[PDB]
Structure 1
Amino acid sequence: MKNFYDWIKEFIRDQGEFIAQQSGWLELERSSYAKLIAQTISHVLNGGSLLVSADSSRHWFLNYILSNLNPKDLKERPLLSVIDFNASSFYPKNDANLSLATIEMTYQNPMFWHVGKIENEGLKTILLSKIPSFLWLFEELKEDCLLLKEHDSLLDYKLLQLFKLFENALFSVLYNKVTL
């Protein structure tokens, strides 16, 4: 076989290279993704709320979203209206209609921010509802979504980047550094 120490060395280079190589992915291909962010931003700046859900492979990312939008030390940031909707009682299982009615009744202005596989018919039904969404999907459930290669080896990195893009965009407009 090949020595681990030589192995790890080669490996480290391809890894970093492949990364640089793909760095442009998002701009190459720039989408409607801007308008989604736009609308989501408007949504949020209008006081609406963000009910975040994720497929079972992306819990770590739901977590990431929650702690990066509202970090332990807020400093002078807003407290952003963000809900871990995965963990919520209203997360649809049997009867999205009740999930949906209750949700509409509890919140003033909810929006669904879902990321990844739609793993049940309950959630499909709600994301197809008329409540505002922010769909980061592997398959275009709907016109207005952000499409993502599921089996991409760099999927995990692009979620950060996109989030980071989203976080920056939202605060750049909240803080009047940019005109939406």
Structure 2
Amino acid sequence: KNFYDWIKEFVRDQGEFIAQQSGWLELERSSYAKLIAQTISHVLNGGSLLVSADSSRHWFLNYILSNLNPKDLKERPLLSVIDFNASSFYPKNLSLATIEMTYQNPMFWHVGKIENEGLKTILLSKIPSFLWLFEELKEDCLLLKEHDSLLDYKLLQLFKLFENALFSVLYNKVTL
């Protein structure tokens, strides 16, 4: 096929599939609303978010941190968000005791695969969590499809939902 013919077809099809799957969140049955609410409550209570992601999702870890605390905060609060992947306490279990000792009120927010047992053990602990996983670990998580070709878009969409929900409660547009 000629490049220019091919690309026209590819682009048309790409947009049509986005459109087709664009209502997926209306059908999503994992408890994302309740999890978002619980995470917002944690933030309001002065809690910290310790954010981690699988190897393929480091870009999305970066996205969370930069969006939650943008370079120019303007009127925004400085939110208690920590890059857990980059932490000396990331488990490769001394990690849990050190975490509990150093942070007043942490909650783990993890996205994607759980790539080692140390992390699994930490996430299975009693400390609160906001888990976006490819399979349920224990307790309601936000469930994603690992080989979904639209996964990357869905991650952005869920983040944008979370940030809107969070600031809607701040700024008193919405009550939990």
**TM superposition score category, shorter chain reference:** over 0.9
Q: Distance in 2 between matches of 1:15 and 1:39?
A: 35
Q: Which runs of 4+ in 1 moved over 4 A?
A: none
Q: CA RMSD in A?
A: 0.7
CA contact (8 A) 2:48 2:80 kept: yes
Shift of the alpha carbon at 1:175?
1.3
CA shift, 1:172, in A, is 0.2
Give the C-alpha shift of residue 22 in structure 1.
Answer: 0.3
TM-score by length of 1: 0.96
Indicate the larger mover: 111-120 or 138-147.
138-147
- 1:118-147, CA deviations, whole angstroms, 9 ceiling, x for partnerless residues? 000000000000000000000111122011
SS of match in other structure, 2:115? coil
Write the distance in 1 (CA, Å) between the matches of 2:154 and 2:144.
9
Contact 2:30 2:140 in 1 (8 A): no
State how far apart, in whole Å, the 2-side matches of 1:144 and 1:110 are: 18
When residues 25 and 128 of structure 1 are mapped into structure 2, their CA distance, relative to the original with a 3 A threshold, is same
Overall identity of the aligned pairs, in %: 99
Structure 1 CA distance, aligned partners of 2:130 and 2:30? 14
Distance (whole Å) between structure 2 residues aligned to residue 40 and residue 29 of structure 1: 19
CA contact (8 A) 2:57 2:111 kept: yes
- In structure 1, the gaps of 5 or more residues are none
- Alpha-carbon distance between aligned partners in 1 of 2:56 and 2:69, rounded to the nearest angstrom: 22
Query: Is 1:123 equivalent to 2:119 in the alignment?
Result: yes
Query: For 1:35-79, what per-residue CA distance to the aligned partner results, in whole angstroms no more than 9, with x for missing partners?
Result: 000001000110000000000000000000000000001001000
Structure 2: distance between partners of 1:128 and 1:175: 34
SS in 2 for 1:153: coil
- Deviation readout 1:93-137 (Å, 9 max, x if unpaired): 1xxx21000100110000000000000000000000000000000
Q: Which residue of 1 aligns with 2:167?
A: 171
Encode CA deviations 1:137-169: one digit per residue, 9 max, x unaligned.
001111220110000000000000000000000
Counterpart position of 1:46: 45
- Could you state the TM-score of these two structures normalised by the residue count of structure 2? 0.98
CA distance in 1 between partners of 2:128 and 2:11 (Å): 42
In the TM superposition, what is the alpha-carbon distance from 1:30 to its structure 2 partner? 4.2
Measure the CA separation in 1 of the matches of 2:29 and 2:5: 39
